[PDB]
Design a protein around this ligand. Structure first.
Ligand SMILES: Nc1nc2c([nH]c(=O)n2[C@H]2C[C@H](O)[C@@H](COP(=O)(O)OP(=O)(O)O)O2)c(=O)[nH]1
Ligand SMILES: Nc1nc2c([nH]c(=O)n2[C@H]2C[C@H](O)[C@@H](COP(=O)(O)OP(=O)(O)O)O2)c(=O)[nH]1
Ligand SMILES: [Mn+2]
Ligand SMILES: [Mn+2]
Lengths: 195, 195
């Protein structure tokens, strides 16, 4: 019912570009929108993956493995699912498994992989696949979770019980300069709403 | 140990701006990052709200009320939680009840409200509050909801069984090309993963 008429570059960077989008509304009227896009994506099904890593251990409730890291655009630290861009020819599932190991040291198994879902559709065309990954936390390999020496940057791992995720996220945000990711928080809400 | 050292504007548009952010890592090294920001931002609690509206009717399954609309940045239709910006001096709960009524016609009650949470920290500083709102679908107010869409807003309302949300989402995606929002998908995933 509505159709893209054209997309004009406004400004460019090495990773992000601002565009102006002309589209037709249902009435027939031309309208415009300022849209953000990454310059990085090309062939992949989506820009990246977010990983929902379910840490399963015989003596414990299931935990969700999250990472905390400084996020320049936020000018602060954020708590998020492990996530990253997907590489070329690399499948979402593979990107997820790699990204998880690199950021946390855990070796997981694919449980499921979502279609491409949007991050902030009013602002950008950015999409990811949400990949659920189980981790056997009793396996000796996952006893000593340590990222590869030169994985990349400064990431802290934080595991939280599934049965209390929302409360535990709220606690961390309170003290203080931490922002929880919106997908993490939405996941935590459903966990609570389903008890 | 990590902080923002400077923000160099790269391009500003009527709605959105792109800039380069210099920050200090824990090693004491200087690094940049291309970040996005809505040109419209004030001293508030967040940029906007997203509403998780739970439609409740006696002897019925609970439903989640979602909206579908064309999103210029995506060049196509997306399925999202109702959402909009917060007004001056307006609480998030108030903006939530208001935005819900505008887009869907439903009159709900505040169940709970999140701290500000980040939309896509690797890209932008954007934040929202996620507000859980219950809707008494048996109340006369809610028997025949009347959406009052703002100018140039064309929003279709869709209610899906909470009990079967993920599969119902997949079933919509199957019927035609559209993109499910990542916050919605995260919510629906956790409903299945719960305990
Ligand atoms: N990025 C961007 N935002 C815009 C433009 N035009 C415009 O009006 N906006 C604002 C309007 C909206 O604030 C927002 C789109 O998000 P949504 O969930 O639809 O918000 P709402 O329900 O309106 O509050 O961007 C534009 O060209 N670009
Ligand atoms: N938007 C953006 N993404 C970046 C930058 N640097 C960088 O490495 N990435 C992406 C690609 C890296 O793999 C990831 C870290 O973020 C940057 O300055 N800006
Ligand atoms: Mn809206
Ligand atoms: Mn609106």
């Amino acid at each position: 019912k509505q159709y893209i008429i054209s997309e004009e570059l406004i400004s460019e960077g090495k990773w992000v570009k601002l565009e102006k989008t002309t589209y037709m509304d249902p009435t027939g009227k031309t309208r415009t929108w300022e849209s953000v896009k990454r310059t990085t994506r090309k062939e992949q099904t989506a820009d990246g993956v977010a990983v929902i890593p379910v840490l399963q251990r015989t003596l414990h409730y299931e935990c969700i493995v999250l990472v905390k890291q400084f996020r320049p655009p936020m000018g602060g630290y954020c708590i998020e699912f492990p996530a990253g861009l997907i590489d070329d020819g690399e499948t979402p599932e593979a990107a997820a498994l790699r990204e998880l190991e690199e950021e946390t040291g855990y070796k997981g198994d694919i449980a499921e992989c979502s279609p491409a879902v949007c991050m902030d559709p009013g602002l950008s065309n950015c999409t990811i696949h949400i990949v659920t990954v189980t981790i056997n936390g009793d396996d000796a390999e996952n006893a000593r979770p340590k990222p590869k020496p030169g994985d990349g940057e400064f990431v802290e791992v934080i595991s939280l019980p599934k049965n209390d995720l929302l409360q535990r996220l709220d606690a961390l945000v309170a003290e203080e300069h931490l922002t929880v990711d919106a997908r993490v928080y939405s996941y935590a809400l459903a966990l609570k709403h389903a008890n």
